[PDB]
Coordinates of C-alpha atoms in Angstrom, one line a residue:
Chain I
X1 CA 75.5 100.2 124.6
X2 CA 78.9 98.5 124.4
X3 CA 78.9 95.1 126.1
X4 CA 75.3 94.8 127.0
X5 CA 72.4 92.4 126.3
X6 CA 69.1 92.7 124.5
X7 CA 66.2 93.9 126.6
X8 CA 62.9 91.9 126.7
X9 CA 60.3 93.6 124.5
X10 CA 58.5 96.1 126.8
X11 CA 60.9 96.1 129.8
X12 CA 62.0 99.7 129.0
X13 CA 58.7 101.5 128.1
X14 CA 60.1 104.9 129.1
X15 CA 62.8 104.7 126.4
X16 CA 62.3 106.9 123.4
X17 CA 64.2 107.5 120.1
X18 CA 65.0 110.9 118.7
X19 CA 64.9 110.8 114.9
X20 CA 65.6 113.0 111.9
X21 CA 65.6 110.4 109.1
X22 CA 67.7 108.3 111.5
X23 CA 68.1 107.5 115.2
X24 CA 70.6 110.0 116.7
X25 CA 69.7 110.1 120.4
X26 CA 67.5 108.8 123.1
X27 CA 65.3 110.1 125.8
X28 CA 62.8 109.4 128.6
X29 CA 59.1 110.0 128.8
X30 CA 58.4 111.6 132.2
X31 CA 54.7 112.2 131.6
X32 CA 52.3 111.7 128.6
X33 CA 53.6 114.8 126.7
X34 CA 57.1 115.5 128.0
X35 CA 60.4 113.7 127.1
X36 CA 63.5 114.5 129.0
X37 CA 66.9 114.1 127.1
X38 CA 70.4 115.6 126.8
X39 CA 71.0 119.1 125.5
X40 CA 73.8 118.3 123.1
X41 CA 71.2 116.1 121.1
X42 CA 69.6 119.3 120.0
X43 CA 68.1 119.5 116.5
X44 CA 65.6 122.0 115.1
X45 CA 63.5 119.1 113.6
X46 CA 63.1 116.0 115.8
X47 CA 60.5 113.3 115.7
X48 CA 60.1 111.3 118.9
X49 CA 59.7 107.6 118.5
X50 CA 57.9 105.8 121.3
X51 CA 56.9 102.1 121.4
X52 CA 60.1 101.1 119.6
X53 CA 61.7 97.7 119.9
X54 CA 63.5 97.2 116.6
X55 CA 64.5 100.6 115.2
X56 CA 65.2 99.5 111.7
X57 CA 61.7 98.2 110.8
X58 CA 58.1 99.3 111.5
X59 CA 56.4 96.6 113.6
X60 CA 53.1 98.5 113.8
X61 CA 52.9 99.3 117.5
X62 CA 55.0 102.5 117.5
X63 CA 54.1 106.1 118.2
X64 CA 55.8 108.8 116.1
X65 CA 55.3 112.2 117.7
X66 CA 56.9 115.6 116.8
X67 CA 58.8 117.7 119.3
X68 CA 56.7 120.8 119.5
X69 CA 58.9 122.5 122.2
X70 CA 62.6 121.7 122.7
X71 CA 64.0 123.3 125.9
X72 CA 67.7 122.9 126.7
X73 CA 68.9 124.0 130.2
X74 CA 69.7 127.8 130.2
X75 CA 73.2 127.0 131.4
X76 CA 74.1 124.1 129.1
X77 CA 77.7 124.5 127.9
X78 CA 78.6 122.9 124.6
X79 CA 82.2 122.5 125.5
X80 CA 82.0 121.2 129.1
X81 CA 78.6 119.5 128.7
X82 CA 77.5 120.9 132.1
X83 CA 73.7 121.2 132.4
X84 CA 73.4 118.6 129.6
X85 CA 69.6 118.2 129.9
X86 CA 66.8 119.0 127.5
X87 CA 63.0 119.0 127.8
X88 CA 60.8 118.0 124.9
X89 CA 57.1 118.7 124.7
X90 CA 55.4 116.3 122.4
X91 CA 53.2 117.9 119.7
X92 CA 50.4 115.7 121.2
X93 CA 49.8 113.5 124.2
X94 CA 50.8 109.8 123.7
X95 CA 48.9 106.7 124.6
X96 CA 50.4 105.1 127.8
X97 CA 50.4 101.3 127.0
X98 CA 52.6 98.6 128.4
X99 CA 54.9 99.7 125.5
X100 CA 54.8 103.4 126.4
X101 CA 55.2 104.3 130.1
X102 CA 56.6 107.2 132.1
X103 CA 59.6 107.1 134.4
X104 CA 59.6 108.7 137.8
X105 CA 62.0 111.5 138.6
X106 CA 64.6 111.2 141.4
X107 CA 63.3 111.5 145.0
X108 CA 66.9 111.0 146.2
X109 CA 70.4 111.6 144.8
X110 CA 71.4 107.9 144.6
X111 CA 74.7 106.8 146.4
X112 CA 77.8 105.3 144.8
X113 CA 77.3 101.6 144.1
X114 CA 73.6 101.9 143.3
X115 CA 72.6 99.4 140.6
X116 CA 71.2 101.0 137.5
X117 CA 69.9 100.1 134.1
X118 CA 71.3 102.0 131.2
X119 CA 69.5 101.5 127.8
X120 CA 69.8 102.5 124.2
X121 CA 70.2 102.0 120.4
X122 CA 73.7 103.4 120.3
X123 CA 77.0 101.8 119.2
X124 CA 77.8 98.4 120.6
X125 CA 81.5 98.5 119.6
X126 CA 84.1 100.4 121.7
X127 CA 86.4 100.3 118.7
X128 CA 84.5 100.3 115.4
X129 CA 80.8 100.8 114.7
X130 CA 77.7 98.6 115.1
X131 CA 74.1 99.8 115.3
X132 CA 71.7 97.4 117.1
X133 CA 68.2 96.7 115.6
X134 CA 66.6 96.0 119.0
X135 CA 67.1 97.9 122.3
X136 CA 70.2 97.1 124.3
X137 CA 70.3 97.2 128.1
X138 CA 73.2 97.4 130.5
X139 CA 73.4 96.9 134.3
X140 CA 75.9 99.5 135.5
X141 CA 76.6 100.8 139.1
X142 CA 77.0 104.5 140.1
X143 CA 80.7 105.1 140.7
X144 CA 82.2 107.3 143.5
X145 CA 82.6 110.9 142.5
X146 CA 86.2 110.3 143.6
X147 CA 86.8 107.7 140.9
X148 CA 84.8 109.8 138.5
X149 CA 87.0 112.9 139.0
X150 CA 90.2 110.8 138.9
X151 CA 89.1 109.4 135.5
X152 CA 88.6 112.9 134.1
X153 CA 90.4 115.7 136.1
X154 CA 88.7 119.1 136.0
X155 CA 86.0 117.7 133.7
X156 CA 83.5 116.6 136.4
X157 CA 81.1 118.9 138.0
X158 CA 78.4 118.5 140.8
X159 CA 75.9 118.0 138.0
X160 CA 77.7 115.0 136.5
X161 CA 78.0 111.4 137.6
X162 CA 80.1 108.4 136.3
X163 CA 78.2 105.2 135.9
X164 CA 80.0 102.1 134.6
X165 CA 83.1 99.9 135.1
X166 CA 86.7 101.2 135.4
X167 CA 88.0 98.0 133.8
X168 CA 85.9 99.0 130.7
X169 CA 84.1 96.4 128.6
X170 CA 80.5 97.6 129.4
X171 CA 79.6 101.3 128.7
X172 CA 77.3 103.6 126.8
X173 CA 78.3 104.8 123.3
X174 CA 77.4 106.9 120.3
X175 CA 73.7 107.0 119.8
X176 CA 72.8 106.5 123.5
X177 CA 73.1 110.2 124.4
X178 CA 70.0 111.5 126.1
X179 CA 69.1 108.0 127.1
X180 CA 68.0 106.7 130.5
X181 CA 70.0 105.5 133.5
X182 CA 67.3 104.2 135.7
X183 CA 68.1 103.2 139.3
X184 CA 65.4 101.7 141.4
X185 CA 62.6 103.0 139.2
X186 CA 64.0 106.5 139.2
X187 CA 65.9 108.3 136.3
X188 CA 69.1 109.1 138.1
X189 CA 71.1 109.8 134.9
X190 CA 71.1 110.8 131.2
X191 CA 73.7 109.4 128.8
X192 CA 76.1 112.3 128.2
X193 CA 79.8 111.6 127.4
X194 CA 83.0 109.9 128.2
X195 CA 86.4 109.3 126.5
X196 CA 85.8 106.8 123.8
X197 CA 83.4 103.9 124.7
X198 CA 84.0 101.0 127.1
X199 CA 87.7 102.0 127.6
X200 CA 89.5 101.2 130.9
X201 CA 89.7 104.1 133.3
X202 CA 87.2 106.0 131.2
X203 CA 83.7 105.4 132.7
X204 CA 80.6 106.9 131.1
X205 CA 79.7 110.4 132.4
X206 CA 76.0 111.1 132.8
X207 CA 73.9 114.0 133.9
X208 CA 73.0 113.7 137.6
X209 CA 69.2 114.3 137.3
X210 CA 68.5 114.8 141.0
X211 CA 69.9 118.4 140.6
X212 CA 67.2 119.4 138.0
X213 CA 64.0 118.1 139.6
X214 CA 62.7 121.6 140.5
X215 CA 63.7 122.8 137.1
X216 CA 62.1 120.0 135.2
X217 CA 58.9 120.4 137.3
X218 CA 58.8 124.2 137.0
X219 CA 59.4 124.4 133.3
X220 CA 56.8 121.8 132.3
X221 CA 54.2 123.2 134.7
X222 CA 54.7 126.7 133.2
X223 CA 54.8 125.6 129.5
Chain G
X3 CA 110.7 137.8 94.7
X4 CA 110.6 134.0 95.4
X5 CA 107.0 134.2 94.3
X6 CA 108.1 134.6 90.7
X7 CA 110.2 131.4 91.0
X8 CA 107.4 129.2 92.6
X9 CA 104.2 130.4 90.8
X10 CA 106.4 129.8 87.7
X11 CA 107.6 126.4 88.9
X12 CA 103.9 125.5 89.4
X13 CA 103.0 126.2 85.8
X14 CA 105.7 124.0 84.4
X15 CA 104.8 121.1 86.7
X16 CA 101.1 121.2 85.6
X17 CA 102.1 120.9 81.9
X18 CA 104.6 118.1 82.6
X19 CA 102.3 116.3 85.1
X20 CA 99.4 116.1 82.7
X21 CA 101.8 115.0 80.0
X22 CA 103.6 112.4 82.1
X23 CA 100.2 111.1 83.2
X24 CA 98.7 110.4 79.8
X25 CA 102.0 108.7 78.6
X26 CA 102.2 106.3 81.5
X27 CA 98.6 105.3 81.1
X28 CA 99.3 104.7 77.4
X29 CA 102.3 102.6 78.5
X30 CA 100.5 100.5 81.1
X31 CA 96.9 99.9 79.7
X32 CA 94.2 98.3 81.8
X33 CA 96.0 98.6 85.1
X34 CA 96.8 100.7 88.2
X35 CA 99.5 103.4 87.8
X36 CA 101.4 105.8 90.0
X37 CA 104.0 108.4 88.9
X38 CA 105.9 111.5 90.1
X39 CA 106.2 113.9 87.2
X40 CA 107.4 116.6 89.7
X41 CA 110.5 114.6 90.8
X42 CA 111.6 114.0 87.2
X43 CA 112.0 117.8 86.6
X44 CA 115.1 118.4 88.7
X45 CA 117.2 115.7 86.9
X46 CA 116.1 117.3 83.6
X47 CA 117.0 120.8 84.8
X48 CA 120.2 119.1 86.0
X49 CA 120.6 117.6 82.5
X50 CA 119.6 120.7 80.6
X51 CA 122.7 122.2 82.0
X52 CA 125.1 119.7 80.5
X53 CA 123.3 119.3 77.2
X54 CA 124.0 122.2 74.7
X55 CA 122.5 123.4 71.5
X56 CA 119.2 121.9 70.2
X57 CA 119.2 119.4 73.1
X58 CA 119.1 122.2 75.8
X59 CA 116.3 124.0 73.8
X60 CA 114.2 120.9 73.6
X61 CA 114.5 120.2 77.4
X62 CA 113.9 123.8 78.3
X63 CA 110.9 123.8 76.0
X64 CA 109.5 120.7 77.8
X65 CA 110.5 121.9 81.3
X66 CA 108.5 125.0 80.4
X67 CA 111.6 127.2 81.2
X68 CA 112.9 130.4 79.3
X69 CA 116.7 129.7 79.8
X70 CA 119.1 128.0 82.2
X71 CA 119.7 131.3 84.0
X72 CA 116.4 130.8 85.9
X73 CA 116.5 127.0 85.8
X74 CA 119.3 127.1 88.4
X75 CA 117.4 129.5 90.7
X76 CA 114.2 127.4 90.4
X77 CA 116.0 124.2 91.5
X78 CA 118.4 126.0 93.8
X79 CA 115.2 127.3 95.5
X80 CA 113.5 123.9 95.3
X81 CA 116.7 122.5 96.8
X82 CA 116.4 124.6 100.0
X83 CA 113.2 123.1 101.3
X84 CA 113.4 119.4 100.4
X85 CA 113.3 117.2 103.5
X86 CA 110.3 116.0 105.5
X87 CA 107.6 118.1 107.4
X88 CA 104.1 117.3 108.7
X89 CA 101.5 114.7 107.5
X90 CA 103.4 112.6 105.0
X91 CA 106.5 110.5 104.3
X92 CA 107.6 111.6 100.8
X93 CA 110.8 110.1 99.5
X94 CA 112.1 111.7 96.3
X95 CA 115.4 110.5 94.8
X96 CA 117.3 111.1 91.5
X97 CA 120.9 110.3 90.3
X98 CA 123.1 110.0 87.2
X99 CA 125.4 107.1 86.6
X100 CA 128.2 107.5 84.1
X101 CA 130.4 104.5 83.0
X102 CA 133.6 104.3 85.2
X103 CA 135.8 105.0 82.1
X104 CA 134.6 108.6 82.0
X105 CA 136.2 111.9 83.1
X106 CA 133.4 114.3 84.2
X107 CA 133.5 118.0 85.0
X108 CA 134.8 118.1 88.6
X109 CA 133.4 121.5 89.4
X110 CA 129.9 120.9 88.3
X111 CA 129.3 117.6 90.0
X112 CA 129.1 120.2 92.8
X113 CA 126.6 122.6 91.2
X114 CA 124.8 119.2 91.0
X115 CA 125.3 118.7 94.7
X116 CA 124.7 122.4 95.6
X117 CA 121.8 123.2 93.3
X118 CA 120.4 119.8 92.6
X119 CA 121.6 118.1 95.7
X120 CA 122.6 115.0 93.7
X121 CA 126.0 113.7 92.8
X122 CA 127.2 112.2 89.5
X123 CA 128.5 108.7 90.0
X124 CA 130.7 106.5 87.9
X125 CA 130.0 102.8 88.1
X126 CA 131.3 99.7 86.2
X127 CA 128.6 99.4 83.6
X128 CA 130.5 96.5 82.0
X129 CA 129.6 94.7 85.3
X130 CA 125.8 94.6 84.9
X131 CA 125.1 92.7 88.1
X132 CA 127.7 94.7 90.0
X133 CA 126.6 98.0 88.5
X134 CA 122.8 97.1 88.7
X135 CA 123.1 96.1 92.3
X136 CA 125.1 99.2 93.2
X137 CA 122.3 101.3 91.7
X138 CA 119.4 99.4 93.4
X139 CA 121.4 99.9 96.6
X140 CA 121.6 103.7 96.5
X141 CA 117.9 103.7 95.6
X142 CA 117.2 101.2 98.4
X143 CA 119.2 103.2 100.9
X144 CA 117.5 106.5 99.8
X145 CA 114.0 105.0 100.2
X146 CA 114.6 103.0 103.4
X147 CA 114.4 99.8 101.3
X148 CA 110.9 100.8 100.0
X149 CA 112.1 100.7 96.4
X150 CA 114.2 97.7 95.6
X151 CA 115.1 96.4 92.1
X152 CA 114.8 99.7 90.3
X153 CA 117.0 98.5 87.4
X154 CA 117.6 95.1 85.9
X155 CA 120.9 93.7 84.4
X156 CA 119.2 92.9 81.0
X157 CA 119.1 96.7 80.7
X158 CA 122.8 97.2 81.2
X159 CA 126.1 96.6 79.2
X160 CA 129.2 98.8 78.9
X161 CA 127.5 100.1 75.8
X162 CA 125.5 102.0 78.4
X163 CA 127.4 105.2 79.0
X164 CA 124.7 106.7 81.3
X165 CA 121.5 105.9 83.2
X166 CA 119.0 108.2 85.0
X167 CA 117.4 106.5 88.0
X168 CA 114.5 108.1 89.8
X169 CA 112.6 106.8 92.9
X170 CA 109.6 108.2 94.7
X171 CA 107.8 106.8 97.8
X172 CA 104.6 107.8 99.6
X173 CA 102.6 106.9 102.6
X174 CA 100.7 109.4 104.7
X175 CA 98.8 110.0 108.0
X176 CA 95.3 111.5 107.6
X177 CA 94.3 114.6 109.5
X178 CA 91.6 112.3 111.0
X179 CA 92.1 108.6 110.5
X180 CA 89.9 105.6 109.5
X181 CA 89.2 102.9 112.1
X182 CA 90.6 99.5 111.2
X183 CA 87.7 97.8 112.9
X184 CA 85.5 99.7 110.6
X185 CA 87.2 98.4 107.4
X186 CA 85.4 95.6 105.7
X187 CA 85.1 94.2 102.1
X188 CA 82.6 96.4 100.2
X189 CA 81.7 96.5 96.5
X190 CA 83.8 98.0 93.8
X191 CA 82.8 98.3 90.2
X192 CA 85.7 97.2 88.0
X193 CA 83.4 97.6 85.1
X194 CA 79.7 98.0 84.3
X195 CA 79.5 94.2 84.2
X196 CA 82.0 93.3 87.0
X197 CA 81.8 94.0 90.7
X198 CA 84.2 92.7 93.2
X199 CA 84.6 93.1 97.0
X200 CA 87.6 95.1 98.3
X201 CA 88.7 96.1 101.8
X202 CA 87.0 99.4 102.0
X203 CA 87.9 102.0 104.7
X204 CA 84.8 103.7 106.2
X205 CA 85.1 107.1 108.1
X206 CA 83.8 110.6 108.4
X207 CA 86.0 113.4 107.1
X208 CA 85.8 117.2 107.0
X209 CA 86.6 117.4 103.3
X210 CA 86.4 119.8 100.4
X211 CA 83.9 118.3 97.9
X212 CA 83.1 119.3 94.3
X213 CA 80.7 118.1 91.7
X214 CA 82.5 118.9 88.4
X215 CA 80.3 118.8 85.3
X216 CA 83.2 119.7 83.0
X217 CA 84.7 116.3 84.0
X218 CA 81.4 114.5 84.7
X219 CA 83.0 113.6 88.0
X220 CA 83.1 114.2 91.7
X221 CA 86.2 115.8 93.3
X222 CA 87.0 115.1 97.0
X223 CA 90.0 116.4 98.9
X224 CA 91.0 114.7 102.1
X225 CA 93.8 116.3 104.1
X226 CA 96.7 114.7 105.9
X227 CA 98.1 116.2 109.1
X228 CA 99.4 119.7 109.2
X229 CA 97.0 120.7 106.4
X230 CA 99.8 121.0 103.8
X231 CA 99.3 117.7 102.0
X232 CA 96.0 116.7 100.3
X233 CA 94.7 113.5 98.6
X234 CA 92.9 114.5 95.4
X235 CA 90.3 112.0 94.2
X236 CA 88.3 112.7 91.0
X237 CA 85.6 110.0 90.8
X238 CA 83.8 109.8 87.3
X239 CA 80.0 109.6 87.4
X240 CA 80.1 106.7 85.0
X241 CA 81.5 103.3 86.1
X242 CA 83.5 103.3 82.8
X243 CA 83.9 107.0 82.7
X244 CA 87.7 106.7 83.5
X245 CA 89.3 106.6 80.1
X246 CA 87.0 109.5 79.2
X247 CA 88.2 111.4 82.2
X248 CA 91.9 110.8 81.3
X249 CA 91.2 112.6 78.1
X250 CA 89.8 115.7 79.8
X251 CA 92.7 115.5 82.3
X252 CA 95.0 116.1 79.3
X253 CA 94.2 119.8 79.9
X254 CA 96.7 121.2 82.4
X255 CA 94.0 123.6 83.7
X256 CA 91.1 121.3 84.1
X257 CA 92.2 120.7 87.7
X258 CA 92.6 124.4 88.8
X259 CA 89.1 125.1 87.4
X260 CA 87.8 122.0 89.2
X261 CA 89.2 123.2 92.5
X262 CA 87.2 126.4 92.4
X263 CA 83.9 124.6 92.6
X264 CA 85.3 122.7 95.6
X265 CA 83.3 123.5 98.8
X266 CA 83.7 122.5 102.4
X267 CA 81.5 119.7 103.8
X268 CA 81.4 116.8 106.2
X269 CA 80.8 113.5 104.5
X270 CA 81.2 109.8 105.3
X271 CA 84.0 108.6 103.0
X272 CA 84.2 105.0 101.8
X273 CA 87.7 104.6 100.4
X274 CA 89.3 101.2 99.3
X275 CA 92.9 100.7 100.6
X276 CA 95.4 100.6 97.8
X277 CA 99.1 100.0 96.9
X278 CA 100.7 100.8 93.5
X279 CA 104.2 100.1 92.4
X280 CA 105.0 101.3 88.9
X281 CA 108.3 101.1 87.0
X282 CA 108.2 103.7 84.2
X283 CA 110.5 103.9 81.2
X284 CA 111.2 107.7 81.3
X285 CA 113.3 107.2 78.1
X286 CA 110.2 106.0 76.2
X287 CA 107.8 108.4 78.1
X288 CA 110.0 111.6 78.0
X289 CA 110.9 110.8 74.4
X290 CA 107.1 110.9 73.7
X291 CA 107.0 114.3 75.3
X292 CA 109.6 115.9 73.0
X293 CA 112.8 115.1 74.8
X294 CA 114.6 112.7 72.4
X295 CA 118.0 114.3 72.0
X296 CA 119.0 113.4 75.5
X297 CA 118.8 109.7 75.0
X298 CA 120.4 109.9 71.5
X299 CA 124.1 109.6 70.5
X300 CA 125.9 112.7 69.1
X301 CA 122.7 114.6 69.5
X302 CA 122.7 114.8 73.3
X303 CA 125.8 117.0 73.5
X304 CA 126.6 116.4 77.2
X305 CA 129.8 118.4 76.8
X306 CA 129.3 120.2 80.2
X307 CA 128.7 117.0 82.2
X308 CA 132.3 116.1 81.3
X309 CA 135.7 117.7 81.9
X310 CA 136.7 116.8 78.4
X311 CA 133.5 118.0 76.6
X312 CA 133.2 114.5 75.2
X313 CA 130.6 112.1 73.5
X314 CA 127.7 111.1 75.8
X315 CA 124.0 110.5 75.8
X316 CA 121.5 108.8 78.1
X317 CA 121.0 105.0 77.7
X318 CA 118.3 104.5 80.3
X319 CA 115.9 106.5 82.5
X320 CA 113.8 104.6 85.0
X321 CA 111.2 105.7 87.5
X322 CA 109.9 103.5 90.2
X323 CA 107.0 104.8 92.3
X324 CA 105.3 103.3 95.4
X325 CA 102.2 104.7 96.9
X326 CA 100.5 103.3 100.0
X327 CA 97.0 104.1 101.2
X328 CA 95.6 102.8 104.5
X329 CA 93.6 103.7 107.7
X330 CA 96.7 105.3 109.4
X331 CA 96.3 108.8 110.7
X332 CA 95.4 111.0 113.7
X333 CA 92.8 111.8 116.4
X334 CA 93.5 108.9 118.9
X335 CA 92.2 105.4 117.8
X336 CA 88.6 104.1 118.1
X337 CA 85.3 105.7 119.4
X338 CA 87.1 108.9 118.3
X339 CA 84.5 111.9 118.2
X340 CA 85.8 115.1 119.9
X341 CA 87.5 116.5 123.1
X342 CA 85.1 114.9 125.6
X343 CA 83.2 112.5 123.3
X344 CA 79.5 113.4 123.4
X345 CA 77.4 110.3 123.1
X346 CA 75.4 111.7 120.2
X347 CA 75.3 110.1 116.8
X348 CA 75.7 112.3 113.7
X349 CA 75.3 110.6 110.3
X350 CA 76.7 112.4 107.2
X351 CA 76.0 111.8 103.4
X352 CA 77.9 108.8 102.0
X353 CA 80.5 109.1 99.3
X354 CA 81.5 105.6 97.9
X355 CA 84.7 105.6 95.8
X356 CA 83.3 102.5 94.2
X357 CA 84.6 102.8 90.6
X358 CA 87.9 103.4 88.7
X359 CA 89.3 106.7 89.8
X360 CA 92.2 109.2 89.4
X361 CA 94.1 110.4 92.4
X362 CA 96.9 112.8 93.2
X363 CA 98.9 114.1 96.1
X364 CA 98.8 117.9 96.4
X365 CA 101.7 119.0 98.6
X366 CA 100.6 122.6 98.9
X367 CA 99.4 123.9 95.5
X368 CA 101.5 121.4 93.6
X369 CA 100.7 117.8 92.6
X370 CA 103.8 115.8 93.4
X371 CA 102.4 112.6 91.9
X372 CA 99.2 111.0 90.6
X373 CA 97.7 107.9 88.9
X374 CA 94.6 105.9 88.6
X375 CA 93.0 102.9 90.4
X376 CA 91.0 100.5 88.3
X377 CA 91.0 97.7 90.9
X378 CA 92.3 97.9 94.5

């Protein structure tokens, strides 16, 4: 998160960390054994880290679980990033504390201007690199698809949504991919891509989760 | 056809490059050096065609050439592909200055401009500050003022019948650049006892890496734009393993054999910025490479350089080189990943160029210059 603040310990329980000897992406716990993330964050070996506050130290309260099943959307394109959503089944059920909670899926496709919370352990510099120890949060609105498409012509689909600020300054960055974009207690987006980070006229593009509800529900229930 | 003029022009260079390299290191002990052995060959081939007898046979020996039949075609070839191109800004210059009171061969100061590209110029050597300034000026105009003060007046007098000035400049743009905001002072091991902090460039690069046991070093190859120019860095496994590496690098083949173990990988390179300005005495250096008759009276036999076939020899031969390595390059400018920048975070193995190293610019199969960095 470029241009954000540090979240209070436990304010973002649904936020997880994908690890392979290092934090590479984020995700969201939607039930005690299923994490929802982005598809481009795919790795054949992934250890999900729930209960995390400070990534670069073990505080004792964490829960490291292995990704037993890793299901990317059938129609995920690596070059357009359409259908950039992945399902992760935890090797075992996790304890649901005040440190590990599940987010609710969208019951509505939120409108432009909806205030959302975007969180992550990704880069904090738009130009340069800086990895945060503690989780970063960012309050960012859903932008009109008209401004979203104008910012990236031909690159936006009905499955994508721009969340952020056109004047830049506050955006998601490298390491936040797969991460949560919670609006009114519902996961409306998943950190996906954007040109650079926190650049003017280049808002962050996220996966519009309200278009995968049936799919997320159907896959989990069947597997 | 032209393959038997270039893969033959590459073999000579490797012998001379390795030779020029050891000599400059032996001339500038405990310090950073930079030299362009490649750029000194054309003036020698231009000089081996004025020098007759045992002088010519000494030069041709060192230039690794059979006769001056093929010497002209090798440089007349090299002289038809000598401007700019992609990735780098290379500035190679060379000229001969003969005292104003001399009558040169009119016709061959043309086979000098039409095979070597250069011109043979007369200058008032008796006027040191007027002749020295006039030389620095052609060198300063040929290098865009990058190389000033090539020659000093305490080196001239009208005893001086001829001087060979040589200038080489380099500064390139990486295929994928380093971010300036990512540059910070990081450790560098000047010795097993000393460790200083130098502005170290951090960035991921799709490089050709090689762990070379024969040299007890690591070889990395970072490319500039266009993929024609490449920065060759051979980092010794020992902090002090540099002077030991120089010894192994006395083998003109140690590099070819090291480049066959070179494999493609994606690593996070940590390279210190560096600038090197070396003024080399080619007279001393070349004379220590078996080319002494050129800079010797009555033994040079420069009877073809002149119209009159008269007494001449070289008095001076200077080389000033200036390399410049920074973050400059391609692929936009900051949070730079790919086309649409996915917000994923990929970490690659780290390679810290944190000890004295040898470098070299490979402009397509041929090292145009090299040196060593003991302290950025």
